[PDB]
Design an enzyme around this catalytic site. Structure first.
Site, PDB file in Angstrom:
ATOM      1  N   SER A 115       0.811  -1.258   0.000  1.00 12.15           N
ATOM      2  CA  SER A 115       0.000   0.000   0.000  1.00 12.15           C
ATOM      3  C   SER A 115       0.839   1.301   0.000  1.00 12.15           C
ATOM      4  CB  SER A 115      -1.017  -0.026   1.171  1.00 12.15           C
ATOM      5  OG  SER A 115      -1.941  -1.049   0.905  1.00 12.15           O
TER       6      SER A 115
ATOM      7  N   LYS B  24       0.331   3.455  -3.040  1.00 12.35           N
ATOM      8  CA  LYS B  24      -0.716   4.467  -3.064  1.00 12.35           C
ATOM      9  C   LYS B  24      -0.162   5.859  -2.966  1.00 12.35           C
ATOM     10  CE  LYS B  24      -4.359   1.506  -0.992  1.00 12.35           C
ATOM     11  NZ  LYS B  24      -3.736   0.142  -0.885  1.00 12.35           N
TER      12      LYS B  24
ATOM     13  N   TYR C 227     -11.292   2.073   3.969  1.00 12.73           N
ATOM     14  CA  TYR C 227     -10.026   1.874   3.242  1.00 12.73           C
ATOM     15  C   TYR C 227     -10.170   0.868   2.136  1.00 12.73           C
ATOM     16  CZ  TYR C 227      -4.964   1.059   2.801  1.00 12.73           C
ATOM     17  OH  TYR C 227      -3.636   0.941   2.359  1.00 12.73           O
TER      18      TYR C 227
ATOM     19  N   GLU D 107      -1.275   9.408   5.309  1.00 16.03           N
ATOM     20  CA  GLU D 107      -1.880   9.779   6.578  1.00 16.03           C
ATOM     21  C   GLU D 107      -1.134  10.894   7.190  1.00 16.03           C
ATOM     22  OE1 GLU D 107      -2.024   6.152   8.902  1.00 16.03           O
ATOM     23  OE2 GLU D 107      -2.858   5.063   7.117  1.00 16.03           O
TER      24      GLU D 107
ATOM     25  N   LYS E 253       2.804   6.087   6.205  1.00 12.21           N
ATOM     26  CA  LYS E 253       2.050   5.124   5.459  1.00 12.21           C
ATOM     27  C   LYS E 253       2.678   3.768   5.678  1.00 12.21           C
ATOM     28  CE  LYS E 253      -1.354   3.826   2.825  1.00 12.21           C
ATOM     29  NZ  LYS E 253      -1.366   2.627   3.738  1.00 12.21           N
TER      30      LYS E 253
ATOM     31  N   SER F 277       1.785  -3.613   3.033  1.00 10.75           N
ATOM     32  CA  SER F 277       2.044  -5.015   3.175  1.00 10.75           C
ATOM     33  C   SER F 277       1.640  -5.716   1.904  1.00 10.75           C
ATOM     34  CB  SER F 277       1.240  -5.576   4.356  1.00 10.75           C
ATOM     35  OG  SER F 277       1.741  -5.180   5.609  1.00 10.75           O
TER      36      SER F 277
END
Ligand SMILES: *[B@]([O])([C][N]S(=O)(=O)[C]C1=[C][C]=[C]C(C([O])=O)=[C]1)OP([O])([O])=O
Length: 355
Positions: free
Chosen positions: A61, A64, A147, A269, A309, A312
Site C-alpha cells: 500500500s 498508493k 479503506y 496519513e 504510510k 504489506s
C-alpha cells in the site's frame, strides 16, 4: 552525534529480525539532507544473497503514495480536476451511479460502498468495468471512509486515462524519472529480476505478489531503499525538484478530512506533530483499516505535521514516515510481514532519539 543513527536503528529494528524470523530488512534514515542506509540479512534465503542497495522490495500500500503523487501531477497540468467524476474519463462509466463520486472521494476512500478488496472472481479488465457499472451507493457519498484498493485503483485508472498512457507508464516514464528514482518499478524488468527479493509468507515460504485487478495503483510498486529515501527527501525538501512535481508533492500533503487524530491526505496519513505513540499506532487499528468510519471536516488544522504510510503484501512489510519541520524521515522495508505496531514503534523511538 550522527554516529548514533546506526546504533539507534540496530537497537530498535535489528531485534525484530529474530523476533519475527524475518530473512531480510532495509532501514533508511534521512536527516538534514544526509542519507543513512542500514541493511540486514538476506534478500533470498535459498540463494544466500545479502540485502543491499540494489535489493528490490514490494511496497504494498505504500504504492498508493505514488498513485496520489501521479494524481497531484495530473491535476497541476490541468488534466483532471478533483471535482470531476470518473465517467468524464472512462466513458463506459458516464451516467452510472459511480459517476456521482468525484475523484477525490475515490482517492480518499469515501464512495460509501467500496470494501478493502474487489471480489475474488473479479480479475479481467471486462470484469472490472462490470463491477463499476453495477455499483450502487450505500452510505451517503463522501461521509464514510472505508479503506479500499478498488477505490484508489479506479482513481489511478482515471489519472492514467487523463494522461493518455496506461498507469504503469505514467509511473515508469513520468513520475519516477521526475523524482530521480532509478530502480523503482511497476513491472520489474528482466535485467533487475536477480535484484528482486523473495518475500516470505507466515510459513517462511518464498512468495511474490500475484497479478490482480487494478493492482498497480493500489499495491503494485517495487523499489529499493535508496529510491525510497530519495522519495522521502522529495517529500521533505522538494525545492530542488521540477516545479510540476513540487506541485504534485504538495498536493499530497493537504489534509482532506479527519477521523479524530488521523487526517487523510492524498495517499499519506497526516498527524499533528508531535504525535503521541498511540495516535500513530491507532491510525492503523482494525477500526480504521477494516471498518467504515464517518469522517468530519478538518477542525484543528495542524500547524506542524508529520505523515506516514504502512504497506504489506503477502511476503513484504513497508513503513515510511517523515516530519518536515525536523527535516527527518525513515523508511523500513522487510521481506516478511511484521505487525504494523512494531514498525511504527521502532520508527517512533528512532526519530524521537535523533531529536
Ligand atoms: B496495503 O498494503 C493493502 N494491503 S493488501 O494486502 O490489500 C495488498 C495485497 C492485495 C492483494 C493481493 C496481495 C498479494 O498477492 O500479496 C497483496 O495496505 P495497509 O498496510 O493495510 O495499508
Amino acid at each position: 552525534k550522527d554516529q548514533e543513527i546506526k546504533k539507534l536503528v540496530d537497537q530498535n529494528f535489528k531485534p525484530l529480525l529474530e523476533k519475527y524470523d524475518v530473512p531480510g530488512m532495509a532501514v533508511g534514515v534521512i536527516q538534514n539532507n544526509k542519507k543513512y542506509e542500514m541493511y540486514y540479512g538476506l534478500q533470498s534465503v535459498q540463494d544466500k544473497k545479502a540485502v543491499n542497495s540494489n535489493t528490490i522490495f514490494e511496497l504494498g500500500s505504500v504504492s498508493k503514495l505514488f498513485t496520489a503523487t501521479a494524481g497531484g501531477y495530473a491535476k497541476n497540468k490541468g488534466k483532471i480536476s478533483f471535482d470531476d467524476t470518473p465517467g468524464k474519463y472512462w466513458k463506459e462509466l458516464k451516467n452510472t451511479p459511480i459517476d456521482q463520486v468525484n475523484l477525490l472521494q475515490l482517492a480518499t476512500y469515501t464512495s460509501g460502498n467500496l470494501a478493502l478488496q474487489f471480489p475474488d472472481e473479479v480479475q479481467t479488465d471486462q470484469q472490472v468495468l462490470t463491477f463499476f457499472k453495477d455499483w450502487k451507493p450505500k452510505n451517503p457519498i463522501g461521509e464514510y471512509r472505508q479503506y479500499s484498493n478498488p477505490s484508489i485503483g479506479l482513481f489511478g485508472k482515471v489519472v492514467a486515462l487523463s494522461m493518455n498512457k496506461p498507469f504503469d507508464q505514467v509511473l515508469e516514464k513520468t513520475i519516477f524519472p521526475a523524482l530521480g528514482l532509478k530502480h523503482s518499478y511497476v513491472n520489474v524488468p528482466k535485467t533487475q529480476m536477480q535484484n528482486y527479493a523473495f518475500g516470505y509468507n507466515q510459513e517462511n515460504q518464498p512468495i511474490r505478489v500475484n497479478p490482480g485487478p487494478l493492482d498497480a495503483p493500489a499495491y503494485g510498486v517495487k523499489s529499493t531503499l535508496p529510491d525510497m529515501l530519495s522519495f522521502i527527501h522529495a517529500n521533505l525538501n522538494p525545492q530542488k525538484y521540477p516545479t510540476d512535481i513540487q506541485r504534485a508533492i504538495n498536493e499530497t500533503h493537504q489534509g482532506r478530512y479527519q477521523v479524530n487524530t488521523m487526517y487523510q491526505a492524498l495517499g499519506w496519513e497526516e498527524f499533528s506533530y508531535p504525535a503521541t505513540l498511540q495516535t500513530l499506532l491507532d491510525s492503523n487499528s482494525e477500526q480504521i483499516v477494516m471498518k467504515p468510519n464517518k469522517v468530519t471536516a478538518i477542525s484543528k488544522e495542524p500547524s506542524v505535521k508529520m505523515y506516514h504510510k504502512t504497506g504489506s503484501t503477502s511476503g513484504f512489510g513497508t513503513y515510511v514516515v517523515f516530519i518536515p519541520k525536523e527535516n527527518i524521515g525513515l523508511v523500513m522495508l522487510t521481506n516478511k510481514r511484521i505487525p504494523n505496531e512494531e514498525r511504527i514503534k521502532a520508527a517512533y523511538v528512532v526519530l524521537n532519539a535523533i531529536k
